[PDB]
Design a protein around this ligand. Structure first.
Ligand SMILES: *C[C@@](*)(O)[C@H](CCCNC(N)=[NH2+])NC(=O)[C@@H]1CCCN1C(=O)[C@H](N)Cc1ccccc1
Ligand SMILES: *[C@@H]1O[C@H](CO)[C@@H](O)[C@H](O)[C@H]1NC(C)=O
Ligand code: NA
Lengths: 250, 40
């Protein structure tokens, strides 16, 4: 997260850290959506140009964390994965269309002050909240700038940007399964996600029921926090039928 | 409730309410920014 700030303790209790077993390394962010399901980006797990094709056994999930590097005894919980599901039309060769994956935990995690699931939007909430100019929030342990890495979870709030502006900001082909967010050059304020933040949630708080909803997943961008450039996010509601299928069937 | 908790597990009913914030009637340091963006 570039130009963000330290999260408060328990500010983002649905935040997950994907961690590689060997060599031990932070891989990306993810979000908790129930006691046993985790949502992340596909490219975290499958991106052959970067030698990423992880199986269930290469990874663990660390939940309830604040510190990037410390093991936080009696606060964080670590789970193994039972199964990984990537969207079957995930397009890593071109534009990361449908950059989405689900992970089933081997055993459910206990909720706590530090661990708690985010909501996924219904249609009315998606229509209502996913509008240009409305702000959501992005969290992660990724880079603080273009390359470094933070001591603790970072947070930033960013406005949703209109599709024409998103389209004209890049030569990469955008689809209806993505949205972009970030300040325009004329707005003065700054902030963006960055490398290492992929998979982390873009959340918005509903003024109708006071609940946090995950509208997006950190997917891609060109550089970090550049003027005239925006972060792209997987459009969660657009893929909710796939999410439902996977969960209902498995 | 959208998902079946037999396969989804528990937590949907109470989703999106943070123990240290909403549940304690405490506001976090920047969430007013989000709320104010809706007035605009
Ligand atoms: C994998 C994630 O850590 C990372 C998120 C970057 C978010 N950046 C900003 N400014 N919000 N994603 C990436 O690094 C993805 C994965 C593949 C390459 N990539 C990019 O964002 C490139 N910089 C641009 C791109 C290349 C191919 C297809 C789509 C986008
Ligand atoms: C990655 O792993 C699968 C098995 O899990 C393998 O069959 C496949 O060829 C690999 N995927 C790609 C896109 O190379
Ligand atoms: Na920008």
């Amino acid at each position: 997260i570039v130009e963000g700030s330290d999260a408060e303790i328990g500010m983002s209790p649905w935040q997950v850290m994907l961690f590689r077993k060997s060599p031990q390394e932070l891989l990306c962010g993810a979000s908790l959506i129930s006691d046993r399901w985790v949502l992340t980006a596909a490219h975290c797990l499958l991106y052959p140009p970067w030698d990423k094709n992880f199986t269930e056994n290469d990874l663990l999930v660390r939940i309830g964390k604040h510190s990037r590097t410390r093991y936080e005894r009696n606060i964080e919980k670590i789970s193994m994965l039972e199964k990984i599901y990537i969207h079957p039309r995930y397009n890593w060769r071109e534009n990361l269309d449908r950059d989405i994956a689900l992970m089933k935990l081997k055993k459910p995690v206990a909720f706590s002050d530090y661990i708690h699931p985010v909501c996924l939007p219904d249609r009315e909430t998606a229509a209502s909240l996913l509008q240009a100019g409305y702000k959501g929030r992005v969290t992660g342990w990724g880079n603080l700038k273009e390359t470094g890495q933070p001591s603790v979870l970072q947070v930033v709030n960013l406005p949703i940007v209109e599709r024409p502006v998103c389209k004209d900001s890049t030569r990469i082909r955008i689809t209806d399964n993505m949205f972009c967010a970030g300040y325009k050059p004329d707005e003065g304020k700054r902030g963006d996600a960055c490398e290492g933040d992929t998979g982390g949630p873009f959340v918005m708080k509903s003024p109708f029921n006071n609940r946090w909803y995950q509208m997006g997943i950190v997917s891609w961008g060109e550089g970090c926090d550049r003027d005239g450039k925006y972060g792209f996010y997987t459009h969660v509601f657009r893929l909710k039928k796939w999410i439902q299928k996977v969960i209902d069937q498995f | 409730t959208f998902f079946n908790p037999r396969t989804f597990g528990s937590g949907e009913a109470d989703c999106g309410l943070r123990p240290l914030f909403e549940k304690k009637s405490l506001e976090d340091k920047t969430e007013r920014e989000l709320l104010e963006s809706y007035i605009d």
